[PDB]
């Protein structure tokens, strides 16, 4: 093993960490598009029904 | 101890970058689903409009 | 773990689509009801505006 010291142990895992909350925020990205967009569908046809009534 | 916080903030630089790398990505994600929600509720009014219109 | 977060957000990803599906759905099917309450509600509303002017 070639290890680095423990006192920058944490420093190589935040890294890693970091590496991975990439991947986490792009995800989280995805995922708030994939909600929104059909509330905004559902808003749309409620103004049209809105303008009908 | 100037060794160590060497290393420390030579780390701290990469993962200070990947973040960043990955917010701004999202940030970009998130403007574009903003615009195309904007786009389907203008194209609703604009169909209300004209329905409010002949009525 | 970055294979076993991927598996996971994969399948929260259907999760999500599902309930959303189902939120659009009701959001259209209140919408529909809230129209037709106030058609009836404006038929209502002639029919004693007529009467009125008979009065």
Request: aromatic fraction near 4%; avoid cysteine.
């Amino acid at each position: 093993a070639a290890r680095p010291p423990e006192e920058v142990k944490a420093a190589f895992d935040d890294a890693i960490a970091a590496r991975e909350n990439e991947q986490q925020y792009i995800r989280e990205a995805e995922a708030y598009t994939n909600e929104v967009q059909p509330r905004a569908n559902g808003q749309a046809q409620r103004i049209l029904e809105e303008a009908r009534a | 101890e100037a060794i160590y916080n060497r290393m420390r903030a030579e780390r701290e630089a990469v993962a200070r970058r990947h973040r960043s790398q990955g917010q701004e990505e999202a940030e970009k994600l998130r403007a574009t689903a903003d615009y195309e929600v904007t786009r389907t509720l203008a194209e609703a009014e604009r169909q209300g409009r004209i329905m409010r219109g002949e009525g």
